[PDB]
């Protein structure tokens, strides 16, 4: 694994241009490599024994798996040394996704709704990255709009591997109660009270379904109530549906495939990828250009 003592000072190799993100822990800046001018994202996090396992897990995931074109590509890691009365800071340096998150995009779109063709394109890109991780026995465990990013060219990249899981076998399971309630699968929530319950990669597929709804309706199901309430109604409520009858029958059938509550009747990542909403799609390059154009207009 990664050893935080071997990391060097970033000196004046990168300059922080502006703040672009604040998620769960630390802050992300637009970074600029001062010699070449190359842009990168720089996630800055105070080093602390309390946060160090989460920081190492994200760094190892990125080192091993971000070569895939749907994961933001890892460049390196530094540590800014600070005087004795001030915590040291880890700089995690990766590919800059210049257009922000999917959540960002939904916020700045009129009516907080994406065109279905953009939803289909984004979902397929998410599914491809997920497919890469699941083949490598990784569960992401935090799929949601905030952690799906867009490049300046409307390419899609997953980020945020802090709470992801590395399994040993294909069949291997996990039972850690973790995530954001609105996006959590029922079988993940079941690990709160049931010590014998477990889940696997299929939980990422549920979260993907909630993310498609988030893109279609501007928020996940149940976001009108506090997260405690939602945690206890997700297992009891019937699986969420799209409310508007105007979406295509394809998209409705896809949401139905993602959101099977009984996870052993939920299709695996590979069957879901052949779903006509994902498979029967116009050219990647054509849809991408339209989305790139809308991102630029609304900027």
């Amino acid at each position: 694994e990664i050893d935080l003592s071997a990391l060097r000072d970033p000196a004046g190799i990168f300059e922080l241009v502006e703040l672009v993100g604040n998620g769960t822990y630390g802050q992300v800046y637009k970074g600029r490599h001062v010699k070449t001018g190359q842009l990168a994202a720089i996630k800055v996090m105070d080093v602390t024994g309390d946060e160090e396992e989460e920081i190492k897990q994200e760094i190892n995931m990125l080192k091993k798996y971000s070569h895939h074109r749907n994961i933001a590509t890892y460049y390196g890691a530094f540590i800014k040394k600070n005087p004795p009365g001030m915590d040291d800071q880890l700089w995690l340096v990766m590919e800059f996704c210049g257009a922000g998150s999917v959540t960002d995009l939904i916020k700045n779109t009129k009516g907080n709704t994406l065109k279905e063709e953009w939803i289909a394109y984004i979902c397929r890109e998410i599914l491809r990255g997920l497919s890469h991780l699941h083949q490598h026995k990784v569960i992401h465990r935090d799929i949601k709009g905030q952690n799906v990013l867009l490049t300046e060219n409307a390419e899609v990249k997953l980020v945020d591997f802090g709470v992801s899981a590395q399994l040993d076998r294909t069949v291997g399971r996990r039972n850690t109660f973790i995530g954001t309630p609105y996006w959590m699968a029922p079988e993940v929530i079941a690990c709160d009270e049931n010590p014998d319950a477990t889940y696997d990669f299929k939980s990422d597929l549920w979260s993907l379904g909630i993310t498609a709804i988030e893109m279609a309706e501007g928020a996940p199901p149940l976001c009108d109530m506090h997260p405690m309430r939602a945690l206890f109604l997700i297992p009891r409520n019937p699986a969420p549906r799209l409310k508007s009858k105007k979406w295509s029958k394809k998209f409705q059938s896809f949401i139905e495939s993602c959101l099977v509550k009984n996870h052993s009747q939920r299709p695996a990542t590979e069957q879901l990828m052949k779903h006509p909403f994902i498979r029967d799609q116009p050219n990647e390059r054509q849809v991408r250009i339209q989305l790139k154009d809308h991102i630029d207009r609304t900027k």
Partner: peptide
């Protein structure tokens, strides 16, 4: 709001209501 982390912690991070 919020998100569930390890060890009985939460943080601001997707929600509230």
């Amino acid at each position: 709001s919020w998100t569930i982390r390890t060890r009985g912690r939460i943080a601001t991070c997707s929600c509230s209501c």
